[PDB]
Amino acid sequence: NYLERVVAINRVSKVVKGGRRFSFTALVIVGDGNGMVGVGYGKAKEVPAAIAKGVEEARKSFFRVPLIGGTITHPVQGEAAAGVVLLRPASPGTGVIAGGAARAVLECAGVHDILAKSLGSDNAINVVHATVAALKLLQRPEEVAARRGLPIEDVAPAGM
RNA sequence: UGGAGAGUUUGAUCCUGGCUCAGGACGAACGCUGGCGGCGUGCUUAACACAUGCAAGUCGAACGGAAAGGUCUC
Ligand SMILES: [Mg+2]
Ligand SMILES: [Mg+2]
Ligand SMILES: [Mg+2]
Ligand SMILES: [Mg+2]
Numbered sequence: 485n486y487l488e489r490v491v492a493i494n495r496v497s498k499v500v501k502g503g504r505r506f507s508f509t510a511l512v513i514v515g516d517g518n519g520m521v522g523v524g525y526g527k528a529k530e531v532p533a534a535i536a537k538g539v540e541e542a543r544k545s546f547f548r549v550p551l552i553g554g555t556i557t558h559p560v561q562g563e564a565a566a567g568v569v570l571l572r573p574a575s576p577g578t579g580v581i582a583g584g585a586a587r588a589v590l591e592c593a594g595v596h597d598i599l600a601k602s603l604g605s606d607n608a609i610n611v612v613h614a615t616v617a618a619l620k621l622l623q624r625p626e627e628v629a630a631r632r633g634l635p636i637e638d639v640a641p642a643g644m
Numbered sequence: 645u646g647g648a649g650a651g652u653u654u655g656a657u658c659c660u661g662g663c664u665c666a667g668g669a670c671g672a673a674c675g676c677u678g679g680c681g682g683c684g685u686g687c688u689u690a691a692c693a694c695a696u697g698c699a700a701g702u703c704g705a706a707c708g709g710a711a712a713g714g715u716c717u718c
């Protein structure tokens with residue numbers, strides 16, 4: 485009952501005396517589609533096995549995403565090894581304006597209204613890691629107001 | 645009120661970094677094809693050389709007059 489997206493599958497190799505031993509990696513995104521998403525790498529000698537391992541890794545590594553009604557609360561910039569991803573909230577009309585990896589992550593997390601731009605490296609793994617880093621950096625109004633005081637010193641027009 | 649990427653250096657990897665493509669636009673040209681209407685638009689090159697016709701006249705209520713028409717007129 486989850487949403488699973490396999491993002492990138494590539495064939496890696498290792499050289500031995502005989503020749504090249506091939507294997508497969510399959511980066512997988514898994515999320516409940518509502519507010520919670522996980523990422524798992526996964527790797528094996530066969531594509532379905534790698535996909536499976538990615539699925540269990542992601543499902544074990546679920547984490548929670550702060551939404552404010554179908555979009556993220558405030559703009560953020562996430563930083564992976566060398567991938568840079570910029571996310572900004574948008575009005576309810578907009579869709580998900582994102583690239584491949586970022587779109588996978590956001591649509592599995594259950595985000596409907598986002599402008600996502602990748603500025604650093606183009607590797608899919610690092611783009612995914614930067615996106616999850618930005619989602620970690622995200623904040624909620626309720627604990628920012630808990631940290632500061634008098635939880636009205638913000639702007640909460642919609643609510644619901 | 646608005647921002648999408650992909651291919652390509654390696655046995656494989658991650659960076660750096662060029663090259664290339666997917667969009668739009670045109671006072672356009674060319675290829676194939678071609679029913680109609682509405683509204684626009686048409687020498688971007690030789691400020692090269694130009695046949696022909698037309699693109700600046702008007703006033704008799706300023707004037708002397710009488711080539712033309714109309715006149716009473718011989
Ligand atoms: Mg770069
Ligand atoms: Mg080399
Ligand atoms: Mg080597
Ligand atoms: Mg490149």
Ligand SMILES: [Mg+2]
Pocket residue numbers: none
């Ligand atoms: Mg000219």
